[PDB]
Design a protein around this ligand. Structure first.
Ligand SMILES: CN[C@@H](C)C(=O)N[C@H](C(=O)N1CCC[C@H]1c1nc(C(=O)c2ccc(F)cc2)cs1)C1CCCCC1
Ligand SMILES: [Zn+2]
Length: 87
């Protein structure tokens, strides 16, 4: 129910934070932002606007939605978008 970062509630706002995303990181800002993540501005650290979970060390082939569900399966934004079955 409760949203940790209301300023990062829209995907456009989240996508804006990836302005200085390192291009050597092999995961795309558009998929990070769509999966609820915004960039904290250092290294490849991101957080989810809803559950406040953090993820780093993004690997080639990582799916932000799958990684979101692996580590933060009770995130209400995750469940709302992808369904309880996905988690
Ligand atoms: C391989 N695929 C990627 C997506 C993945 O699974 N990574 C994992 C991950 O990130 N995990 C696991 C759950 C918590 C979160 C972390 N959180 C932290 C922060 O300290 C932190 C603090 C603030 C932030 F904004 C971001 C992060 C450090 S480990 C780890 C996989 C092993 C190697 C280390 C990273
Ligand atoms: Zn979340």
């Amino acid at each position: 129910e409760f949203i940790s970062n209301l300023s990062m509630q829209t995907h456009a706002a989240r996508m804006r934070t990836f302005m200085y995303w390192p291009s050597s990181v092999p995961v795309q800002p558009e998929q990070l932002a769509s999966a609820g993540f915004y960039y904290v501005g250092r290294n490849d650290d991101v957080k989810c606007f809803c559950c406040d979970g953090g993820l780093r060390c993004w690997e080639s082939g990582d799916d932000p939605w799958v990684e979101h569900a692996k580590w933060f399966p009770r995130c209400e934004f995750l469940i709302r978008m992808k369904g309880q079955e996905f988690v």
